[PDB]
Design a binder for this molecule. Structure first.
Ligand SMILES: NC(=[NH2+])c1ccc2[nH]c(-c3ccc[nH]c3=O)nc2c1
Lengths: 245, 9
């Protein structure tokens, strides 16, 4: 996250950290995710497309730090890895960039509710907040695009939703953004999501709840002017999610 | 105990 504040999982108790193992001895962070229900985490397909070997990923819940432990964390394995079929990566965009991971702990259970582990709400069919709404994003991604390492402490920031009309302006992203995406930016282009934040949540308040409105998907640079962050529009994938829950 | 999506406290 560029800008933002450092935080603790208690402030984002539905955030999931996904890592990959290289038996060599290291586990490296891959992307973030969000807890939908006790056994299901939702993230972005582009995070797994290149190494779709479920057996090599680990998911953690209740984690405030990237490589150190947090008391209250839960470790899980990926029982099912559902990538979207018709996922496409072009020059910038990722289409149908949503993925589901069914998790299981070494004891055989799914997540248990704690002050650091909670689920996030899903929107209703094609229901979104209106542009202007402030939403928050959270993650362990880069703090500057020139960094080659990720922060050890979790971060969060607030961004606002902008219209497609504004995001599809020729000098923003043109028609690379579709109705199945949402764009969110900082009025003063100071904070934003970046590389390492993919998969994590864009949460906004809808109908009085905190809902997962989008999934961090792509963007040109990080916190650049006229280059908003693009998120997968969860509200338009409800059927897809449902057939696998 | 049980989940309540969206609730932080
Ligand atoms: N501007 C954004 N909101 C944004 C979001 C996710 C990104 N992911 C990446 C990225 C950069 C390089 C390699 N892989 C990535 O996912 N850049 C990103 C930028």
């Amino acid at each position: 996250i560029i800008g933002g504040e450092f935080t603790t999982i208690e402030n984002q108790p539905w955030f999931a950290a996904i890592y990959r193992r290289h038996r060599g001895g290291s586990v490296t962070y891959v992307c973030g995710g969000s807890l939908m229900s006790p056994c299901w985490v939702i993230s972005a397909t582009h995070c797994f497309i290149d190494y779709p070997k479920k057996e090599d990923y680990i998911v953690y819940l209740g984690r405030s730090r990237l490589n150190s432990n947090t008391q209250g964390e839960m470790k899980f394995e990926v029982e099912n890895l559902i990538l979207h079929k018709d996922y496409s990566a072009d020059t910038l965009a990722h289409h149908n960039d949503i993925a589901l991971l069914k998790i299981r702990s070494k004891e055989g259970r799914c997540a248990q509710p704690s002050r650091t582990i909670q689920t996030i709400c899903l929107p209703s069919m094609y229901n979104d907040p209106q542009f202007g709404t402030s939403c928050e994003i959270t993650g362990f991604g880069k703090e500057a695009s020139t960094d080659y390492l990720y922060p050890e402490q979790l971060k969060m920031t607030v961004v606002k939703l902008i219209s497609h009309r504004e995001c599809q302006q020729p000098h923003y992203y043109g028609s690379e953004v579709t109705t199945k995406m949402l764009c969110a930016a900082d009025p003063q282009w100071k904070t934003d999501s970046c590389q390492g934040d993919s998969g994590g949540p864009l949460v906004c308040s809808l109908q009085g709840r905190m809902t997962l409105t989008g999934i961090v998907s792509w963007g040109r640079g990080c916190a650049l002017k006229d280059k908003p962050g693009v998120y997968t529009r969860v509200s338009h994938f409800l059927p897809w999610i449902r057939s696998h829950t | 105990l049980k989940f309540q999506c969206g609730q932080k406290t």
